[PDB]
């Protein structure tokens, strides 16, 4: 219990109020309430902005100064940003407080403390009662019940066998493990047979309470907590929605769990192809692919679904936002898909915070909006561990019931089919605390902090880029708008000169406009997509605005090697693009390290420092090649290779044309089960049907799904695979990743259906 | 670091050795090694038997006394039971040790310490070096690498978003949650992109090391760590094995994950029916159901598989051991099924320790045996959290490659299909520590401790039962052999009089013999099944040996209510049977509480204590019925109801006859997906096809699977459901559980396929 | 919480049982259970006959002496004369206790503590659980509910006017009166 006391000047002579406050602080310490005494509102504001738990605020001001009134109101608002229901006591002389009494005072003051005419013991008792009341409502239901049950230490005669961690403390290695992970983790692993807490699979007790709380917080009709991640969540949604006699509309930018759901359901997929830009960044699906006529055309043209052209599709999935932070206008997507489907699934695995900041308005699934009765059913999956605060494997399913809704009894079958009978309650507790953390003022405050950090990094990088350009030097630039317009006053700013409040408040500063060249998605409609500020992509020089390489540049693979050497691991990477994640776990000013690392890379690149000094791990791959070679020598070698081979055109060819479909993904997988598959080298792939999905990095989305033909000799897909293989052969230590292939003696092998 | 010093009398005058040992202890304390000095080998043995970590043992004896030599050898053997590689220093006068030097001495002594002619500093340095060497090899690979990486605190720019728990410490509730679960749990949640540790799904790095270690420890060719429990493990095995064009042989005593695998694969199942006894305990499948002719007959008689009589079945699953501790002779089962199948899956979810105690020899899958080349492929699934020491959702897949084996590339597809892309590494670490805990001497020692505790409980209960019977009173009796025979000397003992060593050593003391009446499995072959000692069933009086009820008895539901009131929750329960689990997390002498609780129940039952005083929660269900009623009044009411209705015959009728099969489980589930299902009351179930499985408790195994007909008016299955419903109506607060039903206003509803 | 340990001679050599009991007492003190260690049943009887609250009894005897068995039974009966449901733990070597196991033993023993082969931490945890179970049933209903409610200190807006004794602490004579009679008397006047 900690009480914060902030008073400036209550009496004309300081000693009276100081002695009264000292007596109160002594009485509070005698009841085990720690006290922090602060004499200035700016100091109190600084104290509050440190993530220190405050159980009660007692403040007093001059009471005749409007400036101190404004400062006190600011202090209380700041306190309630992240500590929402902390009691506030007004310390004041009685007459001064009574003449200032009004509705606005009572909006922020919970109790009165007549510090100059009341015993410190009475005030201390009231403060303690208020603190206890505040603490009793602080925790979310599941976490509260788990903590309450954790004090039980009796041997139950049932599983789990470790019995609250006792089993581990019987060998020395078990004792080390038990001491490392701590007792409370094992004492919450209690099984699903303790009625005090409830059961997750039955959605009873504290688990039912937590799911209702999460549905309220995230704006869903029903919510389901999942302990198998968004992979499991996607599987259960797809299992509840489609059947092998169904046609489904699949975002080609789909996670592999979507293809797993296709395999497990046997549905026949039709694909909407997303757009691409000159950097190899996958962009949004254009509205021309979601229109009812486009979907009917796709169904009529598909070899497997052409006998189902009269059948309404049972399910559609759109990934929003994308891996590179492109956010759809979900309202417009829903309106477009409403003309063809009754079920829309938004895979928002990376997009869980979007509801809690106004910058994302209309660009997510569970919007605060008036809902009509003819809406489609909407599903949203959040990976709570990705960009929210939860342990790995924690996930949510959010449902908004509309047309052709699935009731609880039917949905529970799929839910159980992809779950476990013994969930780990720590994962569910992390889900519950994440939902609580986004609840109320705190979600807005946390999203604001992350967005502001990302904006500071973007503006600093843009400023440095302009400085180096003015000195006719190269540098990295952030991937966002070059110029932003203030919609109120009409004034234009360079991005690095724009006021931070404008960038934090105005959505149009992040919308992809068709007239702008920065995003590179040609023919995108206006007010369709938007850039997520906290997914920061930086661009290495070398790519022209027209789509062709420049005379010189710095490939991103070398910068990635540098960052890995310094511990920074980017989320995504193309030839010239590096993506950095700003999360709610970042601390303020941390991006200075990133800027410093990029500057030191530029220094060593301009100096052509030998790779042995700077990047010994790169040398250790091929010491005969990279030995006696400098940083800029390797960079120019890579850029010359890129200029000669132009793999970006290969990527565009491979992803603009869809492969020929021979069978459903389920049929292809059942070929694997029947042992009718073989490993085929890339040079022999012509005419072969892939047994599993091929996902090259870049662009990180599947080029081929299971049951799709590789194509003839001139197929762009085999060509792209060959290009990646050639790059791997030419540059050891900078090898591309390609899911769905086996690399034997540096050569690519693909599992294919035997003819 | 703790060193144990055990010396008795090294010199004719005690002061010399005492002063030398004091100097050594001082020098050891100066290097931060804690020392425990013990003057007697029995005291040292007692110290070792307390689960205290000992890093080094320094001992000395008389060196001319053979009794002290035997005692010292016993002490070292006891120490290495659970602390296997702890260094042992011999403290001795040089000449005495040298004259006693031989191979047998060096088998247990690692180093010499000439305590009377060497500086204490030199010996202390050598002891410290030995302790460091021992500590450096103590942890298993994955746990060691995770602990080593946990010291890193830098902000990675990738998921998970909480970034080692930093994200939680930004709201007060998050801070409470973070402090409760501790920092190390969040700092190990690092994602699959840290190459220092490796990746679970790629089986690389420390994860590959841990899986190889587990395969060695559990005697498998390959092992897979699973974070979705045995449900997930069963799903991936079944997905890798069968296809919708396949016929499979399914143990009717199957977990619901087996039916989920059937739904997800579309295979056509044929069932082997297990046996039952008079207590409603499900027993083993008899050999007459596994013969090739029996399987061919089942295939030819099945409505769905009768067009596949020439097709070899692709998969079989047997649950071993069963829920009530019946263990198959797995060697004989494998020999029987080898004549019909190439893949046998042993679902050993409750049976993970069996390899590590000789009492279970030949009664588990991965046996230490000479393996021929014509064996079938064997799968075994262990739920490491059930009866081993692991967190919930931890599981293993063990494979022994034989006929029609599945190579790694093909199996990995199913493995990924039922996994998540973001596993929680704490679960894998718990799997690794569980495997390490069963490794070497420690697995034998831990299984021995659990078995001895269960035997002590069984013998004490049998003795009390005999005492009460001699006083012509009733009591509970353990479900095991009444008389055991010593195979060496031929001597017979009553079970409560048998030597504990005989029961712990001789397997035949637990084998179900056809001539014995205790197990009640009529016509069981000899040396076919065996009782697991640590799954202790107790029998309430009331059931005759012939199969019919006696004139009086105590129903087990009331005893279960009593135990629940005292916190004990049994694993399984029938009309007269209560099952208690003894796990490796139990402490010695804990079963005294169970005995005390049963005795106090008997006292209150004989005294007819009013239910308000003893069981207020029972009264709170139906205060108008249970008010003003005693314990024995309720017991006799329940027994009269059982005598009148005889639900055991209903259970026997329902489970001896299989329901008519109308479609595969996948077809029935796809009816759910197509919304062609409805909730049907029990009285209207005639002719209806169940959409999901119906699992009544008792007997806790499915009575109907998905796609099976309920039957006509005289169907035993509808009759059994009606019996359970009638019991629930007559006795509020003692309601049976039935998975697959909905209970609306106390009435049973079953989801059925629309006709 | 106070635990009474009464053991006389469990092993042929005293040091083994003494060291085991010392370890158990240390583990009990680390969980805030005060321990009284007594080596003779007559001394334990004298201790019990002093009106001192005992929350748990842990005892061990020779286990082959019928006289010590009679003395231990007398000690437990004396303890339960005025402290009726105090848990009784038997400290013993496992084999000796198991050969002496019968109905008459279980009539007076609630739990077993294999002091020579069990960790002192496990036994201490079980002792603490037993003590908490015993303490939770000790008070009669009205007294228990009054004590539970007495922690509330909020100003109700109803009578009695003194409001848990706060009203008395406003004059010096009232403060003397309030300190004399104590706070809990006024906080139960609700």
CSV table of C-alpha atoms in Angstrom, one decimal, chain B residues 247-436:
chain,number,residue,atom,x,y,z
B,247,UNK,CA,-10.6,-49.3,-42.1
B,248,UNK,CA,-9.3,-49.0,-38.5
B,249,UNK,CA,-9.6,-51.1,-35.4
B,250,UNK,CA,-10.5,-49.0,-32.4
B,251,UNK,CA,-10.6,-50.0,-28.7
B,252,UNK,CA,-14.1,-49.2,-27.5
B,253,UNK,CA,-12.4,-47.9,-24.4
B,254,UNK,CA,-11.1,-44.9,-26.3
B,255,UNK,CA,-10.5,-41.3,-25.3
B,256,UNK,CA,-12.6,-38.7,-27.0
B,257,UNK,CA,-9.5,-37.5,-28.9
B,258,UNK,CA,-9.6,-40.9,-30.7
B,259,UNK,CA,-13.1,-40.1,-32.0
B,260,UNK,CA,-11.8,-36.6,-32.9
B,261,UNK,CA,-9.1,-38.2,-35.0
B,262,UNK,CA,-11.7,-40.4,-36.6
B,263,UNK,CA,-13.8,-37.3,-37.5
B,264,UNK,CA,-10.7,-35.5,-38.8
B,265,UNK,CA,-9.5,-38.5,-41.0
B,266,UNK,CA,-12.8,-39.9,-42.2
B,267,UNK,CA,-11.7,-43.5,-41.5
B,268,UNK,CA,-14.2,-46.3,-41.0
B,269,UNK,CA,-13.9,-47.8,-37.5
B,270,UNK,CA,-14.3,-51.3,-36.3
B,271,UNK,CA,-14.5,-51.8,-32.5
B,272,UNK,CA,-13.1,-54.3,-30.0
B,273,UNK,CA,-15.4,-54.5,-27.0
B,274,UNK,CA,-13.7,-54.6,-23.6
B,275,UNK,CA,-14.9,-56.7,-20.7
B,276,UNK,CA,-16.8,-55.6,-17.6
B,277,UNK,CA,-17.1,-56.8,-14.0
B,278,UNK,CA,-19.8,-56.7,-11.4
B,279,UNK,CA,-18.7,-53.3,-10.0
B,280,UNK,CA,-19.0,-51.6,-13.4
B,281,UNK,CA,-15.3,-51.4,-13.9
B,282,UNK,CA,-14.3,-51.6,-17.5
B,283,UNK,CA,-11.7,-54.4,-18.1
B,284,UNK,CA,-9.4,-55.5,-20.8
B,285,UNK,CA,-10.2,-56.5,-24.3
B,286,UNK,CA,-10.0,-60.3,-24.4
B,287,UNK,CA,-7.7,-62.0,-26.9
B,288,UNK,CA,-10.7,-63.4,-28.7
B,289,UNK,CA,-11.4,-59.9,-30.0
B,290,UNK,CA,-7.9,-59.3,-31.4
B,291,UNK,CA,-7.4,-62.5,-33.4
B,292,UNK,CA,-7.2,-62.1,-37.2
B,293,UNK,CA,-10.4,-64.1,-37.7
B,294,UNK,CA,-12.2,-61.8,-35.2
B,295,UNK,CA,-11.0,-58.7,-37.0
B,296,UNK,CA,-12.0,-60.1,-40.4
B,297,UNK,CA,-15.4,-61.0,-39.0
B,298,UNK,CA,-15.9,-57.5,-37.6
B,299,UNK,CA,-14.9,-55.9,-40.9
B,300,UNK,CA,-17.3,-58.2,-42.8
B,301,UNK,CA,-20.1,-57.5,-40.4
B,302,UNK,CA,-19.8,-53.7,-40.3
B,303,UNK,CA,-22.3,-51.8,-42.6
B,304,UNK,CA,-19.6,-49.3,-43.7
B,305,UNK,CA,-16.6,-51.6,-44.0
B,306,UNK,CA,-18.2,-54.6,-45.6
B,307,UNK,CA,-16.9,-53.5,-49.0
B,308,UNK,CA,-13.3,-53.5,-47.7
B,309,UNK,CA,-13.0,-57.1,-46.5
B,310,UNK,CA,-9.9,-57.5,-48.7
B,311,UNK,CA,-8.2,-54.4,-47.4
B,312,UNK,CA,-5.6,-54.5,-44.6
B,313,UNK,CA,-6.5,-52.2,-41.7
B,314,UNK,CA,-4.3,-49.2,-41.5
B,315,UNK,CA,-4.3,-48.5,-37.8
B,316,UNK,CA,-5.3,-49.9,-34.4
B,317,UNK,CA,-5.4,-48.2,-31.0
B,318,UNK,CA,-5.5,-49.9,-27.5
B,319,UNK,CA,-5.7,-47.9,-24.3
B,320,UNK,CA,-3.1,-49.3,-21.8
B,321,UNK,CA,-3.4,-49.0,-19.0
B,322,UNK,CA,-7.2,-48.5,-18.6
B,323,UNK,CA,-8.7,-45.8,-16.3
B,324,UNK,CA,-9.0,-48.3,-13.4
B,325,UNK,CA,-5.4,-49.5,-13.7
B,326,UNK,CA,-5.8,-52.7,-15.8
B,327,UNK,CA,-2.6,-53.2,-17.7
B,328,UNK,CA,-2.4,-55.4,-20.8
B,329,UNK,CA,0.4,-57.8,-21.5
B,330,UNK,CA,1.6,-55.6,-24.4
B,331,UNK,CA,3.9,-58.2,-25.8
B,332,UNK,CA,0.9,-60.6,-26.2
B,333,UNK,CA,-1.3,-57.8,-27.6
B,334,UNK,CA,1.4,-56.9,-30.2
B,335,UNK,CA,1.8,-60.6,-31.2
B,336,UNK,CA,-2.0,-60.9,-31.6
B,337,UNK,CA,-2.4,-57.7,-33.6
B,338,UNK,CA,0.7,-58.4,-35.7
B,339,UNK,CA,-1.4,-60.9,-37.7
B,340,UNK,CA,-3.7,-58.2,-39.0
B,341,UNK,CA,-2.0,-54.8,-38.8
B,342,UNK,CA,1.2,-52.9,-39.4
B,343,UNK,CA,0.5,-50.0,-37.1
B,344,UNK,CA,-0.4,-50.3,-33.4
B,345,UNK,CA,-1.0,-47.3,-31.2
B,346,UNK,CA,-0.8,-47.7,-27.5
B,347,UNK,CA,-2.5,-44.7,-25.8
B,348,UNK,CA,-0.5,-44.8,-22.5
B,349,UNK,CA,-1.7,-41.4,-21.3
B,350,UNK,CA,-1.9,-42.6,-17.7
B,351,UNK,CA,1.0,-45.1,-18.2
B,352,UNK,CA,4.2,-43.2,-18.6
B,353,UNK,CA,6.2,-44.6,-15.7
B,354,UNK,CA,5.8,-48.2,-16.7
B,355,UNK,CA,9.2,-48.6,-18.4
B,356,UNK,CA,11.0,-47.6,-15.2
B,357,UNK,CA,9.9,-50.2,-12.8
B,358,UNK,CA,10.4,-54.0,-13.3
B,359,UNK,CA,6.9,-54.7,-11.8
B,360,UNK,CA,5.5,-53.6,-15.2
B,361,UNK,CA,7.7,-55.8,-17.3
B,362,UNK,CA,6.1,-56.9,-20.6
B,363,UNK,CA,3.1,-54.8,-19.9
B,364,UNK,CA,4.0,-51.6,-21.9
B,365,UNK,CA,4.9,-50.7,-25.4
B,366,UNK,CA,8.5,-49.6,-25.6
B,367,UNK,CA,10.1,-52.6,-24.0
B,368,UNK,CA,13.8,-53.4,-23.6
B,369,UNK,CA,13.8,-56.4,-25.9
B,370,UNK,CA,15.6,-57.8,-29.0
B,371,UNK,CA,13.7,-56.4,-32.0
B,372,UNK,CA,13.3,-58.3,-35.2
B,373,UNK,CA,12.8,-56.7,-38.7
B,374,UNK,CA,9.2,-57.9,-39.3
B,375,UNK,CA,7.6,-56.1,-36.3
B,376,UNK,CA,4.7,-53.7,-36.8
B,377,UNK,CA,5.2,-50.0,-36.3
B,378,UNK,CA,4.4,-49.1,-32.7
B,379,UNK,CA,3.2,-45.7,-31.4
B,380,UNK,CA,2.9,-44.7,-27.8
B,381,UNK,CA,1.5,-41.5,-26.4
B,382,UNK,CA,2.3,-40.3,-22.8
B,383,UNK,CA,0.5,-37.5,-21.1
B,384,UNK,CA,3.6,-36.3,-19.1
B,385,UNK,CA,1.4,-34.1,-16.9
B,386,UNK,CA,-0.8,-37.0,-15.8
B,387,UNK,CA,1.4,-39.5,-13.9
B,388,UNK,CA,4.9,-38.0,-14.6
B,389,UNK,CA,6.1,-34.5,-13.5
B,390,UNK,CA,5.2,-32.0,-16.2
B,391,UNK,CA,2.9,-29.1,-16.7
B,392,UNK,CA,-0.5,-29.5,-18.3
B,393,UNK,CA,-0.5,-29.9,-22.1
B,394,UNK,CA,2.9,-31.5,-22.1
B,395,UNK,CA,2.9,-34.8,-24.0
B,396,UNK,CA,5.2,-37.2,-26.0
B,397,UNK,CA,4.8,-39.2,-29.2
B,398,UNK,CA,7.1,-42.2,-29.2
B,399,UNK,CA,7.6,-44.2,-32.4
B,400,UNK,CA,9.2,-47.6,-33.0
B,401,UNK,CA,9.7,-48.1,-36.7
B,402,UNK,CA,8.5,-51.4,-38.1
B,403,UNK,CA,6.4,-52.5,-41.0
B,404,UNK,CA,4.9,-49.6,-43.1
B,405,UNK,CA,6.7,-47.0,-41.1
B,406,UNK,CA,6.2,-43.3,-41.6
B,407,UNK,CA,9.4,-41.3,-42.3
B,408,UNK,CA,10.1,-37.9,-40.7
B,409,UNK,CA,9.1,-35.8,-43.7
B,410,UNK,CA,5.7,-37.4,-44.0
B,411,UNK,CA,5.0,-37.5,-40.2
B,412,UNK,CA,6.1,-33.8,-39.8
B,413,UNK,CA,3.1,-32.7,-41.9
B,414,UNK,CA,0.6,-34.2,-39.4
B,415,UNK,CA,2.7,-32.9,-36.5
B,416,UNK,CA,2.5,-29.4,-37.8
B,417,UNK,CA,-1.1,-29.7,-38.7
B,418,UNK,CA,-2.1,-30.3,-35.1
B,419,UNK,CA,0.5,-27.9,-33.5
B,420,UNK,CA,0.9,-24.2,-33.0
B,421,UNK,CA,3.5,-21.9,-34.6
B,422,UNK,CA,4.1,-20.2,-31.2
B,423,UNK,CA,4.7,-23.0,-28.6
B,424,UNK,CA,5.2,-22.0,-25.0
B,425,UNK,CA,8.7,-23.1,-24.1
B,426,UNK,CA,7.8,-23.7,-20.4
B,427,UNK,CA,5.7,-26.7,-21.5
B,428,UNK,CA,8.6,-28.1,-23.5
B,429,UNK,CA,11.0,-27.5,-20.6
B,430,UNK,CA,8.6,-29.4,-18.2
B,431,UNK,CA,8.6,-32.3,-20.7
B,432,UNK,CA,12.4,-32.2,-20.7
B,433,UNK,CA,12.7,-32.2,-16.9
B,434,UNK,CA,10.2,-35.0,-16.7
B,435,UNK,CA,12.2,-37.1,-19.1
B,436,UNK,CA,15.3,-36.3,-17.1
